[PDB]
Design a protein around this ligand. Structure first.
Ligand SMILES: [Zn+2]
Ligand SMILES: [Zn+2]
Length: 231
């Protein structure tokens, strides 16, 4: 089901959801994949996560114009690292409203990222404060606690079986938790568990650095994180 468009790959996940994949192209690194989502919400399109670069993000927008041909109403980015927020300038040049956790926007200058235009804030139970996420349609945004980074957020797609863990969740056969440089090793397992409990009916778990998996991705990630905490 994958389809290559320029240097990107797109895979349809549901009648109105696609995963976008872009690859890092930097002179001393391998071709590291990062996945985000495209959601068609009736007469508009919603994007979760940029690509690694502005030019890759413009190619996502070009695929949307060709294959869907509806305006992109907003994008949500899941934490302040290059794979999720590296293409913010391309979204703003296209007139697309951008949203991120306040804490992602605070961290963005230190991380080399351009901040989103709007800041999301969260209740004590992890759910997004609705007034900060107006007109998000089927996107249900949840902050599960610190894990892969202090700011990482997750997104369920109402009307589908899909929930997106971003860089917090790894697939059920992952050998490690990946990029831990910014990670909260004490709370990571409970944050992975909180993601699972926030979207308890989701059967397709989408994540940044693995292909879509079953809910076993969630329990495997929480186990890896508990091992690491115990070491
Ligand atoms: Zn990251
Ligand atoms: Zn990542």
């Amino acid at each position: 089901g994958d389809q290559r468009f320029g240097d990107l790959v797109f895979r349809q996940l549901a009648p109105n959801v696609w995963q976008h994949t872009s690859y890092l192209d930097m002179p001393g690194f391998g071709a590291v994949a990062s996945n985000g989502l495209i959601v068609r919400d009736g007469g508009r399109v919603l994007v979760v996560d940029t690509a690694w670069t502005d030019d890759q993000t413009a190619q996502i927008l070009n695929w949307i114009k060709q294959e869907i041909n509806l305006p992109v109403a907003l994008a949500v980015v899941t934490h302040a690292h290059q794979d999720k927020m590296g293409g913010m300038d391309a979204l703003h040049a296209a007139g697309i409203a951008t949203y991120a956790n306040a804490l992602s926007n605070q961290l963005a200058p230190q991380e080399g990222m351009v901040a989103a235009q709007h800041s999301l804030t969260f209740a004590a139970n992890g759910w997004v404060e609705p007034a900060t996420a107006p007109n998000f349609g089927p996107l249900k945004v949840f902050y599960p606690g610190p894990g892969h980074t202090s700011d990482n957020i997750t997104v369920g797609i109402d009307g589908t079986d899909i929930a997106f863990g971003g860089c917090l969740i790894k697939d059920s056969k992952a050998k490690s938790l990946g990029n831990l440089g910014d990670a909260d090793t004490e709370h990571y397992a409970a944050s992975a568990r909180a993601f699972g409990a926030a979207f308890p009916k989701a059967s397709m778990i989408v994540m940044s650095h693995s292909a879509p998996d079953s809910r076993a991705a969630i329990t495997h990630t929480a186990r890896m994180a508990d091992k690491l905490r115990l070491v």
